[PDB]
């Protein structure tokens, strides 16, 4: 057991660097490639990847190349579905709670252990509806945190993340109501999904700005699976700043 940092590149190449202090964007990349993400942990814990089809895969860091060199392709280690990409990387304690979801507005709470699939083809973790995509997984820091969902149409819904049932896999249960045919057409969908503590969100769309303190977020609180509250002009969000005590 020794501290490691796993570094993922834009082209899907990985390596395991010794220590937690490395300059990951400053590493050597192959021509046309560059930094995407880094996670940290211990050499005796798995690193997990989630692909664009909702499958998860675990790799033992001891099998990965070191910081020197340009890494090695994930396609040499994982059996990805045709056209799938590796979009997300996690390294957490076995029992760490996570929020998994699709942009059709369905999801579930699980633990990191539920993502750990050491076989080459990994595990079907989240089932995606027609033309749906995986949301970025969210590490749940406190069980009493609030889930905040914002749709492509500009509706917002907030409720305690404990309200969302825990599962080990599947489609999940409804987070926010988005009509399924509309989602399959790409006409609406879950655009942003957060787990927040007394947080404030500042959201920009071009030169328009809205600031939502706890007072304002109380106003979009509602029951899980409701359609949420429409905010005029809250479409094509391009900047979000979350200040979370």
Curated annotation (Swiss-Prot):
It comes from the Bacteria. It is found in: Cell membrane. Residues 221-245 are annotated as: Disordered. Residues 235-245 have a biased composition (Basic and acidic residues). Topoisomerase IV is essential for chromosome segregation. It relaxes supercoiled DNA. Performs the decatenation events required during the replication of a circular DNA molecule. Belongs to the type II topoisomerase GyrA/ParC subunit family. ParC type 1 subfamily. Heterotetramer composed of ParC and ParE. This is DNA topoisomerase 4 subunit A. It comes from Escherichia coli O157:H7. The lineage of its organism: Bacteria, Pseudomonadati, Pseudomonadota, Gammaproteobacteria, Enterobacterales. The chain holds residues 497 to 742 of 752 of the full protein.
């Amino acid at each position: 057991s020794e501290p490691v940092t796993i570094v993922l590149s834009q082209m899907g190449w990985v390596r395991s660097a010794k220590g937690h202090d490395i300059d990951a964007p400053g590493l050597n990349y192959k021509a046309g490639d560059s930094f995407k993400a880094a996670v940290k942990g211990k050499s005796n814990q798995p690193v997990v990847f989630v692909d664009s089809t909702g499958r998860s895969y675990a790799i033992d860091p001891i099998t990965l190349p070191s910081a020197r060199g340009q890494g090695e392709p994930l396609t040499g280690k994982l059996t990805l579905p045709p056209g799938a990409t590796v979009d997300h990387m996690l390294m957490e304690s076995d029992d760490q709670k996570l929020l998994m979801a699709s942009d059709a507005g369905y999801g579930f709470v699980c633990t990191f252990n539920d993502l750990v699939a050491r076989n080459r083809a990994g595990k079907a973790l989240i089932t995606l509806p027609e033309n749906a995509h995986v949301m970025p997984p969210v590490v749940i820091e406190d069980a009493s945190d609030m889930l905040l969902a914002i749709t492509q149409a500009g509706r917002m819904l907030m409720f305690p993340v404990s309200d969302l049932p825990q599962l080990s896999k599947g489609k999940g249960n409804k987070i926010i109501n988005i009509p399924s045919a509309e989602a399959a057409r790409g006409e609406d969908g879950l655009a942003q999904l957060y787990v927040l503590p007394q947080s404030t969100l500042t959201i920009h769309v071009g030169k328009r700005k809205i600031k939502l303190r706890p007072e304002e977020l109380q106003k979009v609180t509602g029951e899980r699976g409701r359609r949420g509250t429409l905010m005029r002009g809250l479409q094509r969000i391009d900047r979000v700043e979350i200040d979370s005590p």
